[PDB]
Design an enzyme around this catalytic site. Structure first.
Site, short mmCIF file in Angstrom:
data_model
loop_
_atom_site.label_atom_id
_atom_site.label_comp_id
_atom_site.label_asym_id
_atom_site.label_seq_id
_atom_site.Cartn_x
_atom_site.Cartn_y
_atom_site.Cartn_z
N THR A 13 -0.70 94.10 30.59
CA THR A 13 0.68 94.27 30.17
C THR A 13 0.88 95.72 29.76
OG1 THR A 13 1.16 92.00 29.51
CG2 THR A 13 2.21 93.75 28.29
N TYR A 20 16.84 102.95 44.23
CA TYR A 20 16.13 101.91 44.97
C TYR A 20 15.01 102.57 45.77
CZ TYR A 20 18.01 97.16 44.70
OH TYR A 20 18.28 95.87 44.32
N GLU A 60 12.13 100.69 47.43
CA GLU A 60 11.27 99.65 47.95
C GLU A 60 10.18 100.25 48.83
OE1 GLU A 60 14.36 95.90 48.16
OE2 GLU A 60 14.78 97.89 49.00
N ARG A 96 8.26 97.51 28.86
CA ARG A 96 7.89 96.22 29.43
C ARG A 96 7.70 96.39 30.93
NH1 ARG A 96 7.61 92.26 25.90
NH2 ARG A 96 8.76 92.45 23.93
N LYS A 146 2.41 95.73 24.37
CA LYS A 146 1.38 95.25 23.44
C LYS A 146 0.61 96.43 22.91
CE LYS A 146 1.02 90.66 25.31
NZ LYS A 146 1.45 90.40 26.68
#
Ligand SMILES: Nc1nc2ccn(CCCc3ccc(C(=O)N[C@@H](CCC(=O)O)C(=O)O)c(F)c3)c2c(=O)[nH]1
Ligand SMILES: Nc1nc2ccn(CCCc3ccc(C(=O)N[C@@H](CCC(=O)O)C(=O)O)c(F)c3)c2c(=O)[nH]1
Ligand SMILES: Nc1nc2ccn(CCCc3ccc(C(=O)N[C@@H](CCC(=O)O)C(=O)O)c(F)c3)c2c(=O)[nH]1
Ligand SMILES: Nc1nc2ccn(CCCc3ccc(C(=O)N[C@@H](CCC(=O)O)C(=O)O)c(F)c3)c2c(=O)[nH]1
Ligand SMILES: *Cc1c(COP(=O)(O)O)cnc(C)c1O
Ligand SMILES: *Cc1c(COP(=O)(O)O)cnc(C)c1O
Ligand SMILES: *Cc1c(COP(=O)(O)O)cnc(C)c1O
Ligand SMILES: *Cc1c(COP(=O)(O)O)cnc(C)c1O
Lengths: 461, 459, 461, 459
Positions: free
Chosen positions: C235, C54, C56, C244, C238
């Site tokens: 993105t 984590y 953040e 992703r 692609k």
């Protein structure tokens, strides 16, 4: 202290100001398209004891008691409103509680739309009103631009007409929920049928804001928007020659019923009424409501159609008398009560023309024209017939007013050649004695011409 | 057609309805706390030729011309407004164009807040006005609760007073951008200093909506909310005894790690919200009439007036207490009285309908305890209207006598009836009941007709 | 229990499904313009222990400790992102924390706009993405249509191009605050300079959504939108051939300083970063961030430009092989990685063609074409090159894929003549033995042709 | 280029950084309450070829084809989701496409609420998550406070527990359309039945955001919020020990003056909000990895796991109490401990930085009392991560021993230093201080390296 002392007896300071305002109205030639002179019968009801009565709610659905008399007055105002515009009480209701035209419009949006639902109206420089969603490139101006998302449809600059083709194209993309068909500065008639076609296609409400042309619609001297519109708001004054109030006309009854057979009913009444009260307004101005009922019965009478017919004749007379003196008209002329003059083809602007005409007791207003190139110096005036027509002005009297205007326009043209920026233009009309006296001369000839005509209302105030 | 005919000659149907209401006001005991009888001097200006002048904009900043005189009228009105409330023009401006009190409040929210910004006012059943953001449990009612997010604060039902502590608690969590200090049904003085402390803590504008008490404030017979409020709105009628219009007072001047004096930015935002944002052309006839009234409020007559309004409501309060009636918060310090009729066995809905049939106009009032949906068990009674008719203390004691006879009539009908519509239909159909009402109505109307009535003679 | 047991050892049910998905990817000819096959180097970082951390906040501005290593990985991802698109770290920053392309777009709107601020994007049936403000005549579809007010700009139906003239006209009226220049189904290149002209005029932000063409921009085989755009989202997958994730590129430095002399700075960085976190997202997918950094360095290499050059060659080869077999292309052809075929001039629709091609291990997608007359049966397919090009497909291999498609298109044409509505069409391909076996034949020939080519990633999953 | 090279061979710069973090996790005592160590079985699916499949839509309702296998994967994930929480598919559906917990919560608000509709959650400094509508006193922080109007509810600082009474009081006034029952820093069980009563009264959806405790709920070692919540959201990591994704459980069936059974309308609105409204194509590689984890959560191993997580946090709680530390709410009933270091003379900001330098990762926590701006005087310590490394009760007592040595180091530095940056710079510059830290870091890393670590060996 009884409260029955007269105004001239108890407040002389205010009494003089009342008289000087009546004297200014009498000695001047009011040509503002929105102004009018109210009948004494309505002013007696405007300043009546009905001001004292709180009657929140609606007839039969009020939240106090003691409203037995104001119930009859509001329903009389409702019945006189439907009769004045030749509406079937089975197909149309009317709310007569809006405080003015602006609150009437905002009540319709609150009734039929959610916050930030989409709105389409004529842009303000093109002839639309503030309350049709006027938003500039820098600021949200009208509250209708803040509480709702508005996109303007524009005029065709080559014709001066509403570009109904561009409006249909931009409405398929904007997907509005309401389209206003109403103007504050548009000399031609609105194709309400073409508006209904666009609204029927993009599934939007068609609101007609006949504020400027309500008297002409009532007298059946122009096509009525009720044949196509779902909601019709109007201003009580202007052409209707009433006090300051507002009306909201809404369809009621049966809207459509494929396969169902059960009639899908119109649902405007409860929504419109709830928006006016309790949503937006407080207690109704019962003294206004009674004053407009007085003016609404005056509009049902044969007298009123002859008055509206003279307004179109005077507007047409003003149009030709300006065309036949070297002025251009946007859209070429007029089909209603107003004229939109183009003063770029004369060498002057609307702002300096408004100031030079104001100094000769002629009240007009600047107006943006299609071929403009600024906004502080718009190139046109807006001149209205209904005000002077209520003083029994006829065609030949309006041609004399045009002679008074072009006189002042040429004084401004001469002063513009000697000046440059607008502030030293306006400063010139105040100091230069040759221009000052020549202004005082034209004003004295204007005040003399104006005072001879009658003036509705009281004698002294 | 000259447009100079009398209303009696031009439209006798409407002129008759004018005299019907004039008689209804002259013959009735008007106890609606928000109603007053406007003077003739103001009505003459109200129904004047100023209805004809379109003066969009402001004095010196109009968007047409010809506003030569009404510029002086609007400026005279602003000066008389500040004078009536002892305000310094360097510290206070005022907008006189609001069409009424509701547009006055919507203007302030539009001027200072963004759509959906947070608003806090006294809940409507607890004594707050609609325009303070009243929201139902099922529906957004006032437009203030549609374009802005409102959370209400409540009365402490134990004392009938505003729970300033629960307000402080909930404003810290709700974080409103503007809090309203103003009431439509509240018999006590609002602690504006405590409101200002709460507003300073959550960095909120304090709006004092003094529509019901503006006349008392003007006569300096109750503490002025101008000593604590950022914005002050009021109706020009009610206790001010003017024509129906609205006012928005706002602060001018200085609102001082650099030695920088931060200014007040109310004037331009408040004026822009009234026009061009919300309204159109101002009602100069209404502006001139409220200027007539504001001149009246600066006089020793109006201080005598408002002093008697206090004395009368206290006399009506003491009289109701003597007859065994309960008062929300125990009494009154201003112009109205909140009566709790649940002890005496009658609700406000029934008492309102019986008193209306005997020409005693009042309105029902939800009492602290019973919720909004329950039929209200109280009444709101006001002193200003009858005090304008030169009522005195012993006169209101007589009004309380008439109210008592009306209530005991409604009690016997409730003993004879079941649902509320059965009650309302029994008052018109039962021969004895309709006769005892007609008797009390006659005794009320005779007593009311004897007192003078401000305004015209016939309409 | 250690958590070190292999997936095939501890969850055989899931292991088979993984293998069958890899087998379906291998045996099939993926022609979806948005799909691609990810490198094993990136998949090893995607399924790494970085999922456990984590972190953040942002490097140097985190709210936990123990982020010493993921700080280097994110800044490496930031440096590799600016290098891949040839950006000056003094003029451009990049946020690499968006979970995907949709969150990347929504973060930009939240950063730069207030709720219900106005947005303009290409309409979805015309080639725009959902997140560009897709709203139908009945429903607000995308969250960008709900939290913001969007109006679409359309294609020119006579050309297949973006109607830049209509967009300029409707933007002067809509007065947007952001205009998206990005597509999901548009075979030509976007005039980003003409977009900047419109945005510079209506004072709107120019957002470029190069999601579909990011790999082609990085390889400098098409004009780069960074020369005109203020914000650029993309993105990660692609064309870039990554995992992703999403990226947000924003200008930083000095925007303009008339008379001031003090440089008016770009203010995007703090706004964009705060919108991504803490406004919208929670903890960053550090395992994605590291997988895209792997794929971003692959895009800096000479290998990647040869890959993108083959994608345009294969798209051009697919374009001519379809034109030279009786198919029409909207806009006539292609200048990027995709082809937009028009199958109305063939007798079939996009929906039945997608179903018949899916049954032969050929994955495509329906697409609305300019000359359509419905939406359940669109008249076109969208075919993409980048997927098979990563399998070392070359021009002659794509012409063989077109031969496989038109084979299936003619089976659908024959089945359409025997059927009517679409559901009994699809039902026919499942029951009728003559059509069933003829489908299984074409699929077996397709699976044989596909399996021979290499497949990036792992061997078994 | 085949695209099949190793990461070590293709990109050694990044492959080295992978092993740097793998070592940092293996050598550190991970006490961040929201962090867990994902199994190798899930990571293998996480970094699989499913990253390639664009499956926009839902099983059986995709908008392209080729979703033959991943339809079975998403359906297997939904079934394992309902199985892990003992849910009946006739009464519960689940969406497995949320990218994380934050998108999961934003989906529910978008699905059930209109823009600016009202939301209530535990305030962030009091233990609530950002996505519960956290708003500052100066700025809208979370997007939940931008697109929706949030008012928070608070802890009772006397007890450290949720003030369910003040929540009831304020929800009646604020009238929220949805209330969130879920915490990021709260050591006690949430009274879901009391939340449901409050939600039923103000007619509000009860959303249980069980991101921190989903594993405990799955193992049925603490009460399940599914017995009271309308909607349940969770992260697939944290205590569930899956890959980073999100879940939205929702009610199906019947939600009965006509004999009409009103149905649940969550499924279509929740699914439509996830896609097409908010997200794009789902991360099928993440969906498959959380399906691997959900299979692990249905096993007796995971019940033993979560039982030990409870025992470990209680052991860490009792150990901290023995050494003289204060615990918010006095202890713990779940997986984390809230330590109050204000008694011992140190804040959380200083303790967090010292413990980070000795490879003890925790995060500061605001304690009930000191407000958000004040430097937090507490720490949030979690059991799940080290429990996954087969820690037992006596092991956490050793971790508490290491924490005590770290705190007393930070105290002597605070006695030697003034501001916070002087404190943070003293830890790196002072020769003796940096040496005593290096010693404690070594003793911590040796102790931590001995325990097994889920996942791969090298990365
Ligand atoms: N066709 C048409 N004709 C007429 C004639 C009269 N009216 C009635 C509205 C008069 C009006 C007043 C103020 C503004 C305005 O904007 N004021 C701002 C500027 C700040 C800015 O724009 O940045 C300011 O000076 O304070 C405005 F735009 C319009 C209309 C109409 O509505 N329509
Ligand atoms: N204290 C205080 N006293 C008074 C006395 C007069 N007023 C001024 C308006 C009174 C008022 C109040 C509520 C509603 C109301 O709710 N109406 C809806 C119901 C819709 C729903 O609930 O679904 C309806 O038309 O029936 C209302 F229409 C009018 C006030 C005041 O504002 N405050
Ligand atoms: N050019 C372009 N090509 C492609 C190819 C793929 N995508 C990605 C978006 C796929 C997508 C999914 C659902 C809807 C949709 O609307 N669904 C609603 C209908 C309800 C209604 O509309 O009333 C429903 O069935 O639930 C949609 F409109 C679009 C794009 C793109 O975004 N743009
Ligand atoms: N109980 C609880 N514990 C934890 C532990 C981790 N988290 C998850 C995110 C933690 C978090 C909190 C506040 C801010 C914040 O305010 N940031 C702004 C300041 C802007 C301002 O205030 O003006 C900034 O970037 O500085 C933040 F960026 C990040 C939580 C949680 O959500 N809840
Ligand atoms: C009466 C009142 C209003 C509104 O006045 P209206 O003339 O009905 O618009 C607003 N606030 C308060 C406290 C009021 O008493
Ligand atoms: C004059 C007018 C109004 C009303 O303006 P108010 O001053 O508020 O009465 C509304 N709509 C139009 C088109 C108008 O011309
Ligand atoms: C961690 C958490 C979230 C968000 O999860 P992310 O993966 O960071 O998006 C939401 N709610 C709660 C209670 C959480 O603990
Ligand atoms: C594919 C795409 C996206 C991203 O969609 P996601 O599935 O959320 O990653 C965004 N914009 C455009 C134009 C796209 O083509």
């Amino acid at each position: 202290w009884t409260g029955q002392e007269s105004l001239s007896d108890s407040d002389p300071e205010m009494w003089e100001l009342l008289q000087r305002e009546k004297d200014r109205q009498c000695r001047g030639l009011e040509l503002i398209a929105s102004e009018n002179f109210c009948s004494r019968a309505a002013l007696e009801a405007l300043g009546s004891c009905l001001n004292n009565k709180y009657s929140e709610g609606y007839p039969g659905k009020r939240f106090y008691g003691g409203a037995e008399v104001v119930d009859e007055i509001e329903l009389l105002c409702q019945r006189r409103a439907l009769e004045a515009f030749d509406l079937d009480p089975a197909q149309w209701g009317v709310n007569v509680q809006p405080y003015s035209g602006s609150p009437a419009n905002l009540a319709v949006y609150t009734a039929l739309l959610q916050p930030h639902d989409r709105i389409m109206g004529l842009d303000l420089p093109d002839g639309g009103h503030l309350t049709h969603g006027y938003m500039s490139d820098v600021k949200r101006i009208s509250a209708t631009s803040i509480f709702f998302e508005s996109m303007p449809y524009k005029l065709n600059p080559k014709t001066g007409l509403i570009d109904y083709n561009q409006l249909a194209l931009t409405a398929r993309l904007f997907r509005p929920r309401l389209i206003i068909a109403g103007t504050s500065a548009y000399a031609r008639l609105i194709d309400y049928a073409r508006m209904r076609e666009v609204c029927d296609e993009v599934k939007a409400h068609l609101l007609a804001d006949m504020a400027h042309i309500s008297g002409l619609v009532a007298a059946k001297v122009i096509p009525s928007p009720f044949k196509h519109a779902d909601i019709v708001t109007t201003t009580t004054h202007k052409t209707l020659r009433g006090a300051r109030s507002g009306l909201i006309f809404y369809r009621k009854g049966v809207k459509a019923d494929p396969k169902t057979g059960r009639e899908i009913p119109y649902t405007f009444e409860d929504r419109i009424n709830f928006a006016v009260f309790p949503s937006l307004q407080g207690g109704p101005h019962n003294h206004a409501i009674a004053a407009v009922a007085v003016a609404l019965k005056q509009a049902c009478t044969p007298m009123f159609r002859e008055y509206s017919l003279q307004v179109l004749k005077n507007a047409r007379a003003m149009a030709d008398a300006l065309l036949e003196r070297g002025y251009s008209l946007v859209s070429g002329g007029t089909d209603n009560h107003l004229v939109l003059v183009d003063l770029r083809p004369k060498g002057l602007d609307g702002a300096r023309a408004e100031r030079v005409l104001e100094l000769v007791s002629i009240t007009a207003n600047k107006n943006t024209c299609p071929g403009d190139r600024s906004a502080i110096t718009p190139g046109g005036l807006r001149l209205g017939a209904p005000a002077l027509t209520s003083r029994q002005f006829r065609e030949d009297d309006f041609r004399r007013v045009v002679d008074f205007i072009d006189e002042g326009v040429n004084i401004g043209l001469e002063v513009k050649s000697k000046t440059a920026k607008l502030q030293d233009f306006k400063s010139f009309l105040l100091k230069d004695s040759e221009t000052s006296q020549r202004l005082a001369n034209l004003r004295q000839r204007v005040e003399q011409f104006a005072r001879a005509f009658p003036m509705p209302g009281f004698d002294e105030h």
